[PDB]
Amino acid sequence: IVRPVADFSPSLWGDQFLSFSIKNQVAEKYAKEIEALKEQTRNMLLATGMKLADTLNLIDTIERLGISYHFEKEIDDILDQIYNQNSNCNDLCTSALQFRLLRQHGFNISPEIFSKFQDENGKFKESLASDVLGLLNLYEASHVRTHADDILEDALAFSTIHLESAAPHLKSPLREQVTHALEQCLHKGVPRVETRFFISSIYDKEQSKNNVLLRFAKLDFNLLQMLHKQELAQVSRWWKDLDFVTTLPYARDRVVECYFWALGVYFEPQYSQARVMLVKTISMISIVDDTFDAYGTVKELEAYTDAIQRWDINEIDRLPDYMKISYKAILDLYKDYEKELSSAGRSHIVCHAIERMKEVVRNYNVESTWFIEGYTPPVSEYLSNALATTTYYYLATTSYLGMKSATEQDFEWLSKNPKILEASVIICRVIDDTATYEVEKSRGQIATGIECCMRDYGISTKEAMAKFQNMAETAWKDINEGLLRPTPVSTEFLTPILNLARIVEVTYIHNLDGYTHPEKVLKPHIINLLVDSIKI
C-alpha cells in the first residue's frame, strides 16, 4: 500500500503552551479587585431613573466587554422590564440597539419598531444615511433577523453602503469599530474574539469610557485567560502523551486550534471541564477525519467504520496497526469521560456522544464510497449524509458532556435534530462546501456539494454558490428564531449551538479553511486569546 503523501503544515506553536504556571499572587490580586468592581457594576445596573438609551448602552457595553456572564439575572430582569414597557419613542440608534439586545436574549420584540424609520414602501429613510451611530446599530441588528422580519430586508444593505461611505472620515475609535463591524458583525462573531477586540481597540480608546467597566473587563479577561492557558497546558500534555504527531504523522497536529474551538463554544470558568472534554473530542475526530480523507484504503476504512459501530476493544485485531492506535485511544477517551462524570452521576449521558460519533464515522464511510463509485447524489441525499460529516451534531452533543446541569432530557431534545442545531450544521456545511469547492474539484472529488447542486438543479457554479449562500441565510434566521422564548431547553444549551455557527463564520472568513491552515486565520485569534494578556 502506497498511502498519499503528507501535505499538512506542522503545528506552528511547538511547546509554548505545554507548561503554564499561574502566578497565584497575581490571580488572587485580580480576583480580589474584580470582586469590588463586580459589585460596583452590579449597582450600576440596578440604579434607578436611568434613561432607556443609557440603560441599553450600559448593557451593550458590559456584554461587549465580556463581563455580562457575571450579571445574567440583572441584565435579564432589566431587559424583561424594557420588553414589557415596550416604549416606541426613540431614535434609530436606540431602537436598533433595543431590538438587537432583546432579540439576542430571546425576547421576540416586534420589528414594527423600525416602521417609523421607513417610508410607505418599507425602505429606510435615506435621510438616516448620515446618522452613523444609528446605522452602526441598525447594521448590527440586521443580523439577528428571523423569517418574520422582512421589514428589515433592506437593513443590511442600507446600513452597509452608508457605513462604508462614512467610515474613512470618522474619528477614532469609531472608525475602527465601524470598519471592524463591516468585516465581522457582532452577533455572528466568536464572543471572546469580539470581546478582546472591543476591550483593546475600542473601549480602551473611547473618550467617554467608564473606567470601572474598562478596568473590570481587562482584569476579568486576563484572569480567565489564565484558566484557559491552564486548560490548554493540560490538553497539550494529554495530546503530547498520546504522541499521534509521530505515530500518526499523516494527520493534522492541531490541538491548539481544537482548543480555540472549545473556547469559542464557551469561555466561562464554569465550563472548564466541558471545554477540556470537548477539545479532546475535536482532536480525536480530527484524526478520524484525516484517516478517511488522506490515508486509509477503501478496505481499511470499511473495517474501521464497522469497528466503530461495534464499539468493542475486541475489534482492534480486525484493524491495520496504525488504525489500532486511534481506535484504542477513542474507546479509552470515552471510558475516561464516563469515569470523569462518575462523581456527578452523569456517566449515563456519555452514550449520546458515542452514538453521534458512530454517525459521523458511518457518513465518512459513505462519503468515501460515493467518491470511489463516482456517485453524484441529488442535494437532498447529499445533505442527508454530508450534514453529519461536518461533525456538528457530534460536537454539539459533546459540548453538553461536561455541562453540569445538562440532563438526559437535554440530550433527548438534541438527539431529535432540533431546528436550531440543524441550522448550525447547515451553516457549517454550506460554508465549508463554498470554501473548498475549487480545491476539491481539482482533487477529483465529484461528490462535492456545489457539484451536487449544479447537477441536481441544472444550474451554474455561480447559481449553486448563491443557492448555498441562501441556505446559510435561511439557517441563520432559523438560529435566531431558535433562540426565541419560550426555549425548548434552557438557553444555556442553545448558546453552544449558536457558538458553533459563529466559529464556522470566523474560521472560514475570507473563504479559507482556518483550522487546516491557521496561519492567516486562527493564529491571530490564538495569540490574542491565549498568548497576549490585555495590557492594563
UniProtKB/Swiss-Prot annotation:
<dbReference type="GO" id="GO:0102698">
    <property type="term" value="F:5-epi-aristolochene synthase activity"/>
</dbReference>
<dbReference type="InterPro" id="IPR044814">
    <property type="entry name" value="Terpene_cyclase_plant_C1"/>
</dbReference>
<dbReference type="Pfam" id="PF03936">
    <property type="entry name" value="Terpene_synth_C"/>
</dbReference>
<keyword id="KW-0460">Magnesium</keyword>
<feature type="binding site">
    <location>
        <position position="293"/>
    </location>
    <ligand>
        <name>Mg(2+) 2</name>
    </ligand>
</feature>
<comment type="function">
    <text>Catalyzes the cyclization of trans,trans-farnesyl diphosphate (FPP) to the bicyclic intermediate 5-epi-aristolochene, initial step in the conversion of FPP to the sesquiterpenoid antifungal phytoalexin capsidiol. Produces germacrene A as an enzyme-bound intermediate that is not released by the enzyme, but is further cyclized to produce the bicyclic 5-epi-aristolochene. Mediates, at low levels, the formation of 4-epi-eremophilene and premnaspirodiene from trans,trans-farnesyl diphosphate.</text>
</comment>
<dbReference type="InterPro" id="IPR001906">
    <property type="entry name" value="Terpene_synth_N"/>
</dbReference>
<feature type="binding site">
    <location>
        <position position="289"/>
    </location>
    <ligand>
        <name>(2E,6E)-farnesyl diphosphate</name>
    </ligand>
</feature>
<comment type="similarity">
    <text>Belongs to the terpene synthase family.</text>
</comment>
<feature type="binding site">
    <location>
        <position position="293"/>
    </location>
    <ligand>
        <name>(2E,6E)-farnesyl diphosphate</name>
    </ligand>
</feature>
<comment type="pathway">
    <text>Secondary metabolite biosynthesis; terpenoid biosynthesis.</text>
</comment>
<feature type="binding site">
    <location>
        <position position="436"/>
    </location>
    <ligand>
        <name>Mg(2+) 3</name>
    </ligand>
</feature>
<dbReference type="GO" id="GO:0016102">
    <property type="term" value="P:diterpenoid biosynthetic process"/>
</dbReference>
<dbReference type="InterPro" id="IPR008930">
    <property type="entry name" value="Terpenoid_cyclase/PrenylTrfase"/>
</dbReference>
<dbReference type="InterPro" id="IPR036965">
    <property type="entry name" value="Terpene_synth_N_sf"/>
</dbReference>
<feature type="binding site">
    <location>
        <position position="432"/>
    </location>
    <ligand>
        <name>Mg(2+) 3</name>
    </ligand>
</feature>
<feature type="binding site">
    <location>
        <position position="293"/>
    </location>
    <ligand>
        <name>Mg(2+) 1</name>
    </ligand>
</feature>
<protein>
    <recommendedName>
        <fullName>5-epi-aristolochene synthase</fullName>
        <ecNumber>4.2.3.61</ecNumber>
        <ecNumber>4.2.3.226</ecNumber>
        <ecNumber>4.2.3.227</ecNumber>
    </recommendedName>
</protein>
<dbReference type="GO" id="GO:0000287">
    <property type="term" value="F:magnesium ion binding"/>
</dbReference>
<dbReference type="GO" id="GO:0005737">
    <property type="term" value="C:cytoplasm"/>
</dbReference>
<feature type="binding site">
    <location>
        <position position="440"/>
    </location>
    <ligand>
        <name>Mg(2+) 3</name>
    </ligand>
</feature>
<feature type="binding site">
    <location>
        <position position="252"/>
    </location>
    <ligand>
        <name>(2E,6E)-farnesyl diphosphate</name>
    </ligand>
</feature>
<feature type="short sequence motif" description="DDXXD motif">
    <location>
        <begin position="289"/>
        <end position="293"/>
    </location>
</feature>
<keyword id="KW-0479">Metal-binding</keyword>
<dbReference type="GO" id="GO:0010333">
    <property type="term" value="F:terpene synthase activity"/>
</dbReference>
<feature type="binding site">
    <location>
        <position position="289"/>
    </location>
    <ligand>
        <name>Mg(2+) 1</name>
    </ligand>
</feature>
<keyword id="KW-0963">Cytoplasm</keyword>
<dbReference type="InterPro" id="IPR005630">
    <property type="entry name" value="Terpene_synthase_metal-bd"/>
</dbReference>
<feature type="binding site">
    <location>
        <position position="429"/>
    </location>
    <ligand>
        <name>(2E,6E)-farnesyl diphosphate</name>
    </ligand>
</feature>
<dbReference type="GO" id="GO:0051762">
    <property type="term" value="P:sesquiterpene biosynthetic process"/>
</dbReference>
<feature type="binding site">
    <location>
        <position position="433"/>
    </location>
    <ligand>
        <name>Mg(2+) 3</name>
    </ligand>
</feature>
<dbReference type="Pfam" id="PF01397">
    <property type="entry name" value="Terpene_synth"/>
</dbReference>
<comment type="subunit">
    <text>Monomer.</text>
</comment>
<dbReference type="InterPro" id="IPR050148">
    <property type="entry name" value="Terpene_synthase-like"/>
</dbReference>
<feature type="binding site">
    <location>
        <position position="432"/>
    </location>
    <ligand>
        <name>(2E,6E)-farnesyl diphosphate</name>
    </ligand>
</feature>
<dbReference type="InterPro" id="IPR008949">
    <property type="entry name" value="Isoprenoid_synthase_dom_sf"/>
</dbReference>
<feature type="binding site">
    <location>
        <position position="289"/>
    </location>
    <ligand>
        <name>Mg(2+) 2</name>
    </ligand>
</feature>
<keyword id="KW-0456">Lyase</keyword>
